[PDB]
Every structure is written in C-alpha cells, then in structure tokens.
Design an enzyme around this catalytic site. Sequence first.
Site: not given
Lengths: 311, 312
Positions: B7, B11, B105, B187, B195, B260, B273
């Site tokens: 990827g 980043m 994450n 998290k 979500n 999100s 997701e």
Amino acid sequence: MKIAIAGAGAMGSRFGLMLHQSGNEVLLIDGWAEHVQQIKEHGLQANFNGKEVEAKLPIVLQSEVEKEDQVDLIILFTKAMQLEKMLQDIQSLIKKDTEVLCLLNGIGHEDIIEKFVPMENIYIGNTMWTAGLEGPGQVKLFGSGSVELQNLGDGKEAAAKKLADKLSESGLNAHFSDNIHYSIYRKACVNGTMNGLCTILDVNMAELGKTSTAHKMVATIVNEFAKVAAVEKIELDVPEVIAHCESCFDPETIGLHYPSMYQDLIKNHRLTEIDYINGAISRKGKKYGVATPYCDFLTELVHAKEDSLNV
Amino acid sequence: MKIAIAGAGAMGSRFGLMLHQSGNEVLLIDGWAEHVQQIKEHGLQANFNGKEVEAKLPIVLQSEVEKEDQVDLIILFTKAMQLEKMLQDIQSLIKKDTEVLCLLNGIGHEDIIEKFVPMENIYIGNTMWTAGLEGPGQVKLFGSGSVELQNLGDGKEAAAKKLADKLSESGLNAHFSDNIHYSIYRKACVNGTMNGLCTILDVNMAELGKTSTAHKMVATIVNEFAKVAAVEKIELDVPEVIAHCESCFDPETIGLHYPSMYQDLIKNHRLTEIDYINGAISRKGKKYGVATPYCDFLTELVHAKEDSLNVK
C-alpha cells in the site's frame, strides 16, 4: 348465557348480534362514544346476507360499566395494547365462574387475563368470520365463517367443547381444536419477523425477501419462538413455519404490502405492538432460561425507532 | 531489512521514503497503475520538509510481484476490504521468518494475516505521522509524528522493541506499547456500536443517544466484543468502554455527526465495512464458541439495508 362482548367493533357486533338472536343475554362494551350512543338510541343496525335487521342490544361505554349484571362469559375483541385497560374497566362483571374467550390472535394475553380470572376459566380461539363497520351502530355481515377454540387450564377440554357447542347454537360454527396454541405461535412467528424487520429496514415484504440476509434473520427469530414454545410443550415444525413467514415475500399475494407495524409507526406515528410480539417471546425467554437475543434486539431497535420519531 | 510497503499511498510512501533514506532495501507495492508507472519512470517525488527530494524506489503492481526478492518485513497500509487480496497477491514474498506490521486501525485483521504468517510474526501499530498524496508518484510530507506498536505473539516483546528501534533509525519515532491491542479493541467497540446502529435507525449519534434502548444495545454489543477479547487475553473494562461509546452521544462535541458507516451507505451508496467490524467479532465468536448474536444480527441488518438500497 349472560355474555359480555368486550370490543363491539365489526366482529364483536357480529358475535353480539348472532348470540342475541338465538336467545342469549348480551351486553356490548365499547370505547367509541358515537358508536355506543347510536346503538343505545336506535339499536344495532345490520345488513345480514343481506337483510336489514335491527336488535336492541344493551351497550355501555367501557368507562361507564357501573350497574350492569355480572356475566357467565366475556368474549374479547380488544387489541393487545388496550386489553388490560378493558379488563380493568369491566372487572365488576366478573363472578367466580366467569369464563373468558379470547379471539385476539396473539401470545401472552393469558398473563394479563389471569389477573382477573383463573387460568382454568380462560379459552383461546381463532375466528374465520368476516364483518364490516359501515358507521356508528351500522354493520355489514358478509357471508360464511367458523370459530376454533381451546382451553387453557389443564383438564378443561370438556368445558371447551360445551363452550363451542353453545356458540354453535347461535350459528357461529364453533369447534374445539387442540391446535390453537400451535397456530397462535405460528402466526406470531409471521408477526415477529415481517413487522419488525420491515419497520426497521424501511421495506415492504417483497423487498425484504429480496435481501441476502432475510432468510437468516427470519430463521433465527423463528428458532427463538420455537425454543420458547417447546418449553410450553408446543413443537413447531420450524422449516414449515419459516416457509410460511417467507411466503409473505411473494409480490403476487401480500409482498407489495407494508406490514401493520410499519403502518403503525412509519405512517401513523403510533406506538407499535412490539412488546406483545417479540417482547412476549423475550419475557418468556427470561422466565424459562431461554436465550432470545434476536427478539430482544429487534424489540430494542423498534423502540429506539419509535423514540427517534417521537411517537 | 528488506521491507515491502503493501500500500504505497501517502503514508506508505512516507514510510518507504524514510526507510530507504536510512539504507533499507524497500519495495513499494500498490494497485494504482498510474501511481506505479509514474514512480517506475520518475521515482517517488516528495516535498519533504520542504525540500524537493526523489528516490528511485523499486515498485510493483500488486498482482506482479513474482520477480522480486522475499522480504524480512511487510508494513501494511491497505484498507480492511482490500487486505486479504493484497496478501494473496504478495504471498510469494513471504519467507518463514517474515514479520508483518499492521498499521490498519481495525479489529480482526490478524485473523486474515494469520493465514499467511504465524501469529508470532505479527505486530500491530498506530501511526501519528501525516502525509499527502498530490498526484501519481507525488507526495508532500510535513511535520512530525510517531509510531506505537505491539507484538501479537507471546514472548515477542523483545522482537517488537527491536522492530521499533529499527523504524526509529529511519526517523519514524517508533515505540513499543503494551496497550495497543487493548486500545484497538476499545476503538472497535465504538465502531461496532455507533456505525451500525446509526446506519440502521437513520439517526446521528446524538439522536441515537436520546433513545430509551441505546444503552442496552451498546452494552450488549460491547459485552460480546469483551467476551471474544478475553479469549485473546485482553480484559476490557466494560463499564469504561461502554461510557466511551456513549460519549459519542454528546451533541456539543461529536453527537450531531453521522458516523462514517452512515456516510458510506446512506449518503455515498457504497458498501460498508461491517464485515470487518461486527463481522470480525462474529467470526471469532464462531471459532471460540462464544455467542455474538447482536454482532450477527447487526451485520445481517446492515447487509439487508445495503441490499434494499441496491448497494451490492
């Protein structure tokens, strides 16, 4: 018999009329003031296959049940959410031997009714008659039908058979069936799947059926209903019941319909009957030590949706 | 080290560049054809701090790795929904001792990664660096940052500390932390409640919090996460985690925000997701003999909602 008709809508008016015509002493009880007043002043007017008939049926507003004679039988035609209040309002008519016949197609009503009469005196049934309420004090009485009913109580089969005979003397075509518990559970599975899922997902029954996970959600819920029913010695044919729930997906029959719970909440902005459907299974689950997480969650979701719409 | 950057977005490009500068052998791997081709022809171009720098970093399309040397370390910068495919595509670079550092994450990625390398060689981390992708083969890199990382395999703390040291040699300011796994689960509890529930009920987080049953639904879900986490030797403070989820209800802070997943599905008409949040807990539940019915049902409901919007 002295009979009270607790809920004098179209079906209650049919039963009240037919029972009266055969020589029973009937009292109608209803919450619709204009309905009560019309029948008081002019009697119940009916188109009966299709002859214009009148009957001076005794009727009282359910909030004004003060002086009336006690009854041998109460036949209930009140929605779940209004049942406990109706019973509270009419409890002065209950004597020691008063029997209660419920024609409400739902689960756990007995627990409310039990507060007012012992279990041995409670009967549950289904009616296949039709009836239409044209206006206040005005009914149209369609055509053919039947009644099937069952004792709750243990050892009251003979008593249920006499009750059936007595209703049949008034042309109601009533019969004992030991299959009523089962059929109430099977119907509740339909009510515990289509209603909540369509309400939360914002879909009609056909669109629900087109989703990839509808079968899984329906199957899981039906298995919860069946685990709880098994404790009460009722062994549902789960595959058949699942297929029966899923038959609602057919757009050629009822699939294009949005179910009653969706109509209540999304359209009419009214509280749903969820506590008397999936909630009833959740309550039994807690009592019996049976996990009912999908019924719990669906109930919780529908309440959240109600809250979110300020219903 | 021989390091693969799985990827090579903003980043990944930062990490690749910084690691390269300090003498590591780096291979960039990416699915964006124009990105790959630009870097092949012109190298990776960066505005660093803020000098126009370049590096002729080896780069391959993710489906075209068969000529390349096997690597000592893979650093993953791939979204959950693309991770298993990336690993499938790059698996020829994996030797017996290859370590994998995940900077995604999210919860449950280790179960996908485990199909390709043993748990003892998997490390999880967070990066606080920033990076911008200006165009194909063009990055802007500004300011400071850090990395925190943890071993997933028992007894690999020393190995995690060396990995941190090695990244720090390239200026990445990396450190061992024994609290990464816990904080990732905490998290995920937020991601597994706000979500799905907001998406299904059609509410922002504040409106969810105004409902009478939100607490029950949140509490039930967090307990499922915690039961599964306990099997993996992570003991969540359930009351705290629940309170942390419920802090999202505050309209003065974040409550008026739609989460999100709601943005993905309801607004953007894109797949969610959900399979990598509640679904990951459902999968672990099946493996561990732990009931996760709310995660099962919420996942099923979100998929049904996707389907009902013709998002398939």
